[PDB]
C-alpha cells in the first residue's frame with residue numbers, strides 16, 4: 001500500500017499521460 | 026504509507042504539473 | 051512495498067522516459 | 076516505505092526534473 005497522496009498523484013500522472021497521447025494521436 | 030522521499034517526489038511532481046498548466050493557461 | 055497501481059504507474063513512467071530518450075537519440 | 080523499484084523510479088524522476096531545469100536555465 002501507499003500513502004493516499006501518492007496513489008492520487010500516480011492516478012493523476014497516468015491520466016496526464018493518457019490525455020497527452022490522445023492529444024498527439 | 027510511502028517512503029518519505031517518494032511522498033516528497035510526488036508532491037514536487039504535482040506542483041510541477043500545476044505550474045505547467047498555469048504557464049500554458 | 052507499494053500499492054500495485056503505484057508500482058504499475060512507476061513502471062509505465064520509466065518506460066515512458068526510456069522511449070523518450072531513445073526517440074531523441 | 077515503498078517498493079524499491081518505486082524509490083528508484085522517483086529518484087530518477089527527480090533527477091530528470093533537475094537536469095531539465097538546469098538545461099533550460
Ligand SMILES: CCCCCCCC/C=C\CCCCCCCC(=O)OC[C@H](O)CO
Pocket residue numbers: 002003004005007008011012015016019042046
Ligand atoms: C493535462 C492536465 C493534467 C491532468 C489533470 C487531471 C487532474 C485530475 C485530478 C484529480 C483526479 C484524480 C484523483 C483521484 C483521487 C482519488 C482519491 C484516492 O485515490 O485516495 C486513495 C487512498 O489511498 C484511499 O485512502
Ligand SMILES: CCCCCCCC/C=C\CCCCCCCC(=O)OC[C@H](O)CO
Pocket residue numbers: 007011014015018019053054055
Ligand atoms: C479520455 C481518457 C480516459 C480516462 C482514463 C483514465 C484512467 C486512469 C487510470 C488509472 C487509474 C484508475 C485505477 C484505479 C484502481 C485503484 C485502486 C488501488 O489504488 O489499489 C488497487 C490495488 O490493486 C490493490 O491494492
Ligand SMILES: CCCCCCCC/C=C\CCCCCCCC(=O)OC[C@H](O)CO
Pocket residue numbers: 027028029030032033036037040041044092096
Ligand atoms: C518548474 C520547476 C519544477 C518545480 C519546482 C518545485 C520544487 C519544489 C521543492 C520542494 C517542495 C516540495 C517538498 C515538500 C516536502 C516535505 C517533506 C515530506 O513530504 O516528507 C513526508 C514524510 O513522509 C514525513 O516523514
Ligand SMILES: CCCCCCCC/C=C\CCCCCCCC(=O)OC[C@H](O)CO
Pocket residue numbers: 003004005032036039040043044
Ligand atoms: C501557484 C500554484 C499553487 C501551488 C499548489 C501546490 C499544492 C501541491 C499539491 C499537493 C501537495 C499537498 C498535499 C499535502 C498532504 C500530504 C499528507 C500526506 O502525505 O498523507 C496524507 C494521507 O491522506 C494520510 O496518509
Ligand SMILES: CCCCCCCC/C=C\CCCCCCCC(=O)OC[C@H](O)CO
Pocket residue numbers: 017021052053054055057058061062065066069
Ligand atoms: C510513449 C507512450 C507512453 C508509454 C506507453 C507504455 C504503457 C505501458 C502499459 C503497460 C505496461 C506496464 C505495466 C506493468 C504492470 C504489471 C503489474 C504490476 O506491476 O503489479 C505489481 C503488483 O504490486 C503485484 O500485486
Ligand SMILES: CCCCCCCC/C=C\CCCCCCCC(=O)OC[C@H](O)CO
Pocket residue numbers: 057061064065068069078079080
Ligand atoms: C525499447 C525499450 C526497452 C523497454 C525497457 C523497459 C524496462 C522497464 C524498466 C523497469 C521496470 C522493470 C522492473 C521490474 C522489477 C519489479 C519488481 C518490483 O516491483 O519490486 C522489486 C523489489 O526490488 C522487491 O520488492
Ligand SMILES: CCCCCCCC/C=C\CCCCCCCC(=O)OC[C@H](O)CO
Pocket residue numbers: 067071077078079080082083086087090091094
Ligand atoms: C534526461 C535523462 C533522464 C535521466 C537519466 C537518469 C537515469 C538515472 C538512473 C539511475 C540512477 C538512479 C537510481 C538510484 C537507485 C538506487 C537503488 C535504490 O534506490 O533502492 C532503494 C531500495 O528501497 C532499497 O532496498
Ligand SMILES: CCCCCCCC/C=C\CCCCCCCC(=O)OC[C@H](O)CO
Pocket residue numbers: 028029030082086089090093094
Ligand atoms: C547536476 C545535477 C545534480 C544531481 C542531483 C540529483 C539528486 C537526486 C535527488 C534526490 C535523490 C536523493 C535522495 C536520497 C535519499 C533516499 C533515502 C530514502 O529513500 O528514504 C529516506 C527516508 O527519509 C527514510 O525512509
Ligand SMILES: [Ca+2]
Pocket residue numbers: 003004026
Ligand atoms: Ca500520510
Ligand SMILES: [Ca+2]
Pocket residue numbers: 028029076
Ligand atoms: Ca527509506
Ligand SMILES: [Ca+2]
Pocket residue numbers: 001053054
Ligand atoms: Ca489498494
Ligand SMILES: [Ca+2]
Pocket residue numbers: 051078079
Ligand atoms: Ca516488490
Ligand SMILES: [Cl-]
Pocket residue numbers: 013038063088
Ligand atoms: Cl512524470
Ligand SMILES: [Cl-]
Pocket residue numbers: 001002003006026027028031051052053056076077078081
Ligand atoms: Cl509508494
Ligand SMILES: [Sr+2]
Pocket residue numbers: 001002026027051052053076077078
Ligand atoms: Sr508501503
